[PDB]
Structure formats: structure tokens, C-alpha cells
């Protein structure tokens, strides 16, 4: 019943592994990654991730179709689009790389989802803005802010918390 959240891994292999371990060692049914993986080899490291993967395309993600195939050879369930609007554990999700703010803003203001997830900015935030649970797990790589993070969301109690690496 635990969903893993992460973003902007920017090829940092170490922190990527540290997150892939932290996730396994827990429930974590699925892992949302809205970030810029940035390079194809990042996808191999994930072959070691127990849960499945719902990813979004970061704007730096060059190999757009290679990433998709690869993510699948790793698992048929794994999905990756520019925008993913799904329902999970009886909850409406809108996931996207922080990329396009206009669409992000409207997903929140709209009132069609319960939970909204994005990244891009590298600034982790965790706020409730009109019933909407808005989450940016921050930068797994820790490059711009120097604070490397990821996060786990409780789909049951609607509870969440950051994890520093
Ligand atoms: Mn970005
Ligand atoms: Mn980025």
C-alpha cells in the first residue's frame, strides 16, 4: 500500500541505487518517477527494483523511445508518457515532470484529482491546496540544492514523508 515517489535522478548512479534499495526494503507496490533519468543506462539499474514503474518524461530525456522499450523489457507493466493521469488505491493522480507549469497549475486548480505529483524544479514541496495533495519529491541527485531526496506516500492514511540519502 506504499507508493514510492522520485524524480530528477540526473544519472547519479549512487543515489539511484540508494533509492532502489530503500524502496525494496519497504512495501512500495509501485514507484512513480517523474524526473529526468537522463541516460539509457539508468534503466538497467532499475532492473533491480522490485516494484513496477510509472514514469514521466523529463525535458532532458533525449532517448525518448529507447527509454520506453527498455523500461518495458524490465517489466511489461511499466509506463512512461509526458502526462500520466491514473487512479490508485482509490485516488486520482496527475503526474508530470514540472516541465509545463500551465498544465500543472490547471491540474491542481481543476479539482479533478486528489494527488498531484511533479518534479523538474528540484525543489521538494509537500502541500495541500484545496483537498489536493501536491507533491514534488525533490531531486534524487541532490545537485542544485545539495539535499538529495525521494519519498514514500501512504495511499491508505493519505500520509507522506521525505527521505534524505
Ligand atoms: Mn527538468
Ligand atoms: Mn532536472
Swiss-Prot record:
Mn(2+) 1 binds at residues 8, 10, 36, 122. Keywords: Hydrolase, Manganese, Metal-binding, Nickel. Ni(2+) 2 binds at residues 36, 59, 97, 120. InterPro entries: Calcineurin-like_PHP_lpxH, Metallo-depent_PP-like, MetalloPDE_YfcE-like, MPP_YfcE, PdiEstase_YfcE_CS, Phosphodiesterase_MJ0936/Vps29. Mn(2+) 2 binds at residues 36, 59, 97, 120. Ni(2+) 1 binds at residues 8, 10, 36, 122. Its cofactor is Ni(2+); Mn(2+). Competitively inhibited by phosphate. Coiled coil: none annotated. The keyword Metal-binding applies. The keyword Protease does not apply. Optimum pH is 9.4-9.8. NCBIfam families: yfcE. Belongs to the metallophosphoesterase superfamily. YfcE family. Monomer. This is Phosphodiesterase MJ0936. It comes from Methanocaldococcus jannaschii (strain ATCC 43067 / DSM 2661 / JAL-1 / JCM 10045 / NBRC 100440) (Methanococcus jannaschii).
Amino acid at each position: 500500500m506504499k507508493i514510492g515517489i522520485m524524480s530528477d535522478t540526473h544519472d547519479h548512479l549512487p543515489n539511484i541505487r540508494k533509492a532502489i534499495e530503500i524502496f525494496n526494503d519497504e512495501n512500495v507496490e509501485t514507484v512513480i518517477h517523474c524526473g529526468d533519468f537522463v541516460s539509457l543506462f539508468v534503466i538497467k539499474e532499475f532492473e533491480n527494483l522490485n516494484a513496477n514503474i510509472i514514469a514521466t518524461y523529463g525535458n532532458n530525456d533525449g532517448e525518448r523511445c529507447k527509454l520506453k522499450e527498455w523500461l518495458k523489457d524490465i517489466n511489461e507493466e511499466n509506463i512512461i508518457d509526458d502526462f500520466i493521469s491514473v487512479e490508485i488505491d482509490d485516488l486520482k493522480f496527475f503526474i508530470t515532470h514540472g516541465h509545463h507549469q500551465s498544465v500543472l497549475e490547471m491540474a491542481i486548480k481543476s479539482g479533478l484529482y486528489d494527488v498531484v505529483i511533479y518534479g523538474h524544479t528540484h525543489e521538494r514541496v509537500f502541500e495541500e491546496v484545496d483537498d489536493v495533495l501536491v507533491i514534488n519529491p525533490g531531486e534524487c541527485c541532490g545537485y542544485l540544492t545539495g539535499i538529495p531526496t525521494i519519498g514514500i506516500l501512504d495511499t491508505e492514511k493519505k500520509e507522506y514523508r521525505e527521505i534524505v540519502l
